[PDB]
Amino acid sequence: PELRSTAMDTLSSLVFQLGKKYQIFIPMVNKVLVRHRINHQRYDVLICRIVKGYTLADEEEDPLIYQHRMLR
Amino acid sequence: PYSLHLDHIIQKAIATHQKRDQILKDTEEALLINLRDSQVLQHKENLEWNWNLIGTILKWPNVNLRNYKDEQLHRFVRRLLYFYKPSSKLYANLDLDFAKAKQLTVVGCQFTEFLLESEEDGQGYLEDLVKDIVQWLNASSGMKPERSLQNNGLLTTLSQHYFLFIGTLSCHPHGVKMLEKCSVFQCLLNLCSLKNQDHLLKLTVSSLDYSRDGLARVILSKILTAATDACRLYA
Ligand SMILES: Nc1ncnc2c1ncn2[C@@H]1O[C@H](COP(=O)(O)OP(=O)(O)OP(O)(O)=S)[C@@H](O)[C@H]1O
């Protein structure tokens, strides 16, 4: 019950790289999330943009390309 | 797709191809936390809002202003409406090559479809928005004797994206009804005949939806049969 926030931040930073490749894992994690009433705001933003579409070019993108384009 | 018109076209084609052949609840608490952290209701200053959180409130499944009758959500949608209207001169004045330009347009499209997601409670905002859009387009097209010339404001600012809203208003079956409740299709029909502005026909011919039979194909046929030769070639 104490490692919830750090694991959710790590999970959000991991699913930021994965695009639609994480959509198969969402009903597996959602059981554990609703079982212990775990709410994370950035993870909610990311799965809202994963399940319902945001655009077509940003989903399933190489993360090194994003890090290079945001470093410049 | 780099653009946002072709993105909506491909998404609509994939959606109808999926629809031809066949989530969390968060009732009142997490919605209030998300609209609290969204920073819209705290201060009225634009460009300081958390637009990811706004997109997450507008694109969540079961919040649609029809089952959650809270006054804070009505304040939120009224502030977003007053920001997105071109008469208020807030969204329609930001120029191209902006830092956050595609995100505001995507949030605007999902907002004007979220307003349509409540077909019985979302008239008072949607009608005002589309009336302000057709007022701006009649003012800029040349249907008035004031100036009849604002090509320098449409071509370099985000106010050219107001066709995309009509685009994401044109896909749904309840969308064409609301679009014809105002004088939108007749406005484009009169827009088809003019000779000075060719960019507006490029904007309206690549935004509308021609999936079903209706008044959207009549505008396409009118551009294809009787228009400027360059616009006829592009159509
Ligand atoms: N930049 C802005 N963004 C959003 N609203 C603005 C902005 N500038 C002025 N406003 C005003 O805020 C109004 C919408 O606020 P409401 O939905 O009435 O919420 P409210 O807190 O009751 O507002 P007031 O000022 O307290 S009555 C707009 O229609 C304008 O009257």
With a CB cutoff of 8 Å and minimum separation 6, the contacts of B156 are: B95, B96
3-state secondary structure at position B95 = strand
Give yes or no for a contact between B130 and B167, defined as CB atoms under 8 angstroms apart: no
The span from the CA of A69 to the CA of A52, in Å, is 25
Helix, strand or coil for residue B224?
Answer: helix
Atom number in ligand 1 closest to CA B78: 17
Per-residue b or e along B183-199, where b marks 16 or more CB atoms closer than 10 Å to that residue's CB: ebbebbeebbebeebee
Closest CA to B132 of B162, B158, B109, B108: B162
Instruction: State this model's resolution in angstroms.
Output: 3.2
How crowded is residue B139: how many other Cβ atoms within 10 Å of its Cβ?
Answer: 16
Among candidate residues B146, B150, B116, the one with its CA nearest the CA of residue B130 = B116
Amino acid at B120: E
The minimum CA-CA distance between A10 and chain B, rounded to whole Å, is 19
Report the distance separating Cα B163 and Cα B2, nearest Å: 17
* Interatomic CA distance for residues B208 and B219, integer angstroms: 10
Rounded CA-CA distance B81/B130 in Å is: 11
Among B34, B62, B68, B23, CA closest to A34: B23
Strand partners, B76: none
Contact assignment for A45 to B11 by CB distance below 8 Å: no
Distances (CA, A) of B130 to B12, B58, B70, B71, B85: 21, 19, 24, 23, 9
Query: CA–CA separation, B190 vs B148, rounded Å?
Result: 14
Q: DSSP 3-state assignment of A12?
A: helix
DSSP state of B94: P
Residue B103 CA to residue A36 CA, distance in Å, equals 33
Query: Which numbered atom of ligand 1 lies nearest the CA of B79?
Result: 4
Q: List the one residue out of B40, B178, B156 whose CA is nearest residue B112.
A: B178
Distance from CA of A56 to the nearest CA of B (A): 7
Residues B80, B41 contacting (CB under 8 angstroms): no
Residues linked to residue B198 through DSSP beta bridges, in sequence order: none
Question: Distance between CA B81 and CA B112 in Å, rounded?
Answer: 9
Query: How many Å is the maximal CA-CA distance in chain B?
Result: 58
CA contacts within 13 A on the Cβ side of A58: 15
Distance A64 CA to ligand 1 centre (A): 42
> Residues 6 or more apart from A24 whose CB is under 8 A from it?
none
Closest partner residue to A45 among B1, B4, B56, by Cβ?
Answer: B56
Interchain pair B23, A51: CB under 8 A: yes
